[PDB]
Symmetry: D3
Amino acid sequence: QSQFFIEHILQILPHRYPMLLVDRITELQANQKIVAYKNITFNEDVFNGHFPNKPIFPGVLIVEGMAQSGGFLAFTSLWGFDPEIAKTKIVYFMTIDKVKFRIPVTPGDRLEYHLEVLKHKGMIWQVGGTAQVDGKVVAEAELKAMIAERE
Amino acid sequence: QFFIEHILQILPHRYPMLLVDRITELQANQKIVAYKNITFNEDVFNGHFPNKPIFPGVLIVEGMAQSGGFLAFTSLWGFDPEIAKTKIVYFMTIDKVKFRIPVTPGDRLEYHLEVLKHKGMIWQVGGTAQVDGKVVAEAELKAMIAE
Amino acid sequence: LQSQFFIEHILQILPHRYPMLLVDRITELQANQKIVAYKNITFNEDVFNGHFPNKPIFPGVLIVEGMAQSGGFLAFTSLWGFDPEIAKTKIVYFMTIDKVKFRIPVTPGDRLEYHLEVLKHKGMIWQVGGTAQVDGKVVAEAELKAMIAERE
Amino acid sequence: QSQFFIEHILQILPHRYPMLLVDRITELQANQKIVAYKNITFNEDVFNGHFPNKPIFPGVLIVEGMAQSGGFLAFTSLWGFDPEIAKTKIVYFMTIDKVKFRIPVTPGDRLEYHLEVLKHKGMIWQVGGTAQVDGKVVAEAELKAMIAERE
Amino acid sequence: LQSQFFIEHILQILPHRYPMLLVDRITELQANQKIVAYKNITFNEDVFNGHFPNKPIFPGVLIVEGMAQSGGFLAFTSLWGFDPEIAKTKIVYFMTIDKVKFRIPVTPGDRLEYHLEVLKHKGMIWQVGGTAQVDGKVVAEAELKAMIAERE
Amino acid sequence: LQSQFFIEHILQILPHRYPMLLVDRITELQANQKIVAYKNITFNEDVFNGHFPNKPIFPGVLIVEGMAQSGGFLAFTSLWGFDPEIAKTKIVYFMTIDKVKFRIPVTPGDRLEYHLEVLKHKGMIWQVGGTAQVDGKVVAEAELKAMIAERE
Ligand SMILES: O=C(N/N=C/c1cc(Br)c(O)c(Br)c1O)c1cccnc1
Ligand SMILES: O=C(N/N=C/c1cc(Br)c(O)c(Br)c1O)c1cccnc1
Ligand SMILES: [Cl-]
Ligand SMILES: [Cl-]
Ligand SMILES: [Cl-]
Ligand SMILES: [Cl-]
Ligand SMILES: [Cl-]
Ligand SMILES: [Cl-]
């Protein structure tokens, strides 16, 4: 499939609250690209300390959201929607580079992730793209992932 | 429009009970349109329900009441952070609420409330909660503002 | 078939969990008819951080939620008796809420007692009505219709 | 007064969520004894891990709620209900002795703290008593605290 | 039986979970005799939100709780070694606490070290005593008796 | 003027609070040059409930965040010294992040030590780089360019 919801996401990613930062997958093309998003609301614990009186979604959390989206792309590209194989694999990031923050993300924003496969070889996948809010580029980054066997 | 920081200056509700993220339309003594983003990154989803995230219906109603409260605060004293800060809001009655579609993470929960009747601190509103243009809930409620 | 259940029994029947399991103990239960339960209210609850600062007030919507869960427990055990194995894959949806009226603010230190009576039930759809009480007085009235469903 | 509610407790004790363990004061005789309580509900964070499937209010937290009542007694005995002076004081607990746990406390219980002044000399206060659920003693302990100036 | 266990091993032995599992690593362990472990203290802990605002202090009573869990880890590995299957069926029960002294306040940035020795033990009943240390100084002392039991 | 600071001081300088204040103590500080600081890692942190169940690992992006806050403290104190009053009218933001590499997983029990060096500064624009260490071993490295902005 090309569109996935939280329930499908929960079966692929090992991340859970309060570290699962992807709510829905709206577009996915194997070995090419993924478009996913996370809704930003004031009702998140993170906003108690970032910052009091001034809610701003952490930039590092935006990058984390892009990573999870990218790992979802890499994983589903190879094995598709397979919850089983998913429990036997782990996708952790080795590097991150070219990260730029252009606009602050706040409650009410739909943080949309746009990642594409720059290149991949074996279990090493390199993705890149931007985070967008209402069509505008809020952030950008490149990440290298390593897919390994859990345990 | 009114963003989260403005809402914070009028409504007394704080985390984890501030369920309105933005005000898109406001017409004193008439209606108000606002919304709250729904994300998995919310603590309530740990218990409602595990392995099956569904935004609580009562919280949908709470969001509508808060939206109505904002309409009440501003229709009464305009945008006045000073008066606001001494008040709190109390739910008085809730009636005729119907839930049609479950709200889950990824949804933009939009509130549409019109004033049905008001007097002093006591306000009665009614409207709907919508997701992508569809009515996911309807409700009527009466709230009271106080010191 | 029992009439008194504790938190351990409530956990095996209701799907709700922290921070949305708002029933602490069942004090009386008559199958297909009524139930009496309660939830203790303490400052040591996260909802109080924002409702409101310096003025802790148990939300009215959460009182109604606590009443619905009471009805849910009643609905399930009246249906399959006390069977956690059947219960563990069931969820509960709110369908409607009517005639709610709040009379007295519930605060930390209150023992919120739920009194629910079955008004009408058909299969998975149960319509209960009753009150929430603190120290023998009505703090809230409510009528609600919920549906029990298998996790699909 | 003799009955202080959560709002009065908030103005005297510095403790806040999730460490304010006294919900209401029912009895208070200056320089002698205090009776208060904290409700025990499942809707508390500590139950997430103490213990999963077996909700049991931690024994050490019963003692804390007992110490907190003592602190309230001591403070009110010295200056009465004075929130302004309250902000300038510290009740540092020095010791805890002879603690016995007889019955487990669980969601649905009304934990009643019963403390009395065993000895008061200068800035040092020694209180002792029991914790009770429905008339039955579930715990007992002795505590010594020092009154001082915050900073 | 190892002598140094990490969080992953502790999770498999003790029944405690967040936010009540107050032992991060086991450094030294000698069956039926003594144990050395520690819990890292960081500002990023919910408990500091209220104890107290603008001046984080790790609650003395939690320092004692931490000492108990270390003793509980000793007690169990002593009677059953590293055995998660049997451990999963139990909980630790506090029976008594004595001679606890709080000498030095514990703050974020501190590595809270637990030092306990078996004063007495019979079956599931264990009596340990010792100190809590930060950078070699004693910040707290205590004696306690716990009991391991079936979650029946 | 000082090279050592504890959470009390860190709170007066950084606007970050729970659950995003990720620096517990500063052990070495040198105006316009470098800073050495750390954050203790403990299982008792909310982040571990979801990252990941049964396998607690401190998020790599949070390590970077910790390095950034450290750098930010460095930048500010380098320009105004320990001045709480002015600190509360300013805020350091991340403009860019580069050359980030994760070498070793960070887990409960670890002392995450931040090592930041000032690569270039000119006014409110600061560029730092360095590593995060555990037991003297590099667990991560990164470069950041920040901006000391007006909070209002
Ligand atoms: O119960 C009390 N405990 N206070 C202890 C306490 C200990 C530390 Br050392 C501290 O930093 C702060 Br502030 C306290 O309030 C209390 C403190 C002041 C006035 N009335 C009651
Ligand atoms: O292994 C890493 N990430 N996550 C690992 C991981 C996650 C889950 Br869940 C799991 O079951 C296993 Br075994 C893992 O290794 C990693 C690798 C290098 C640096 N930091 C983190
Ligand atoms: Cl940021
Ligand atoms: Cl619902
Ligand atoms: Cl209310
Ligand atoms: Cl205990
Ligand atoms: Cl303490
Ligand atoms: Cl990571």
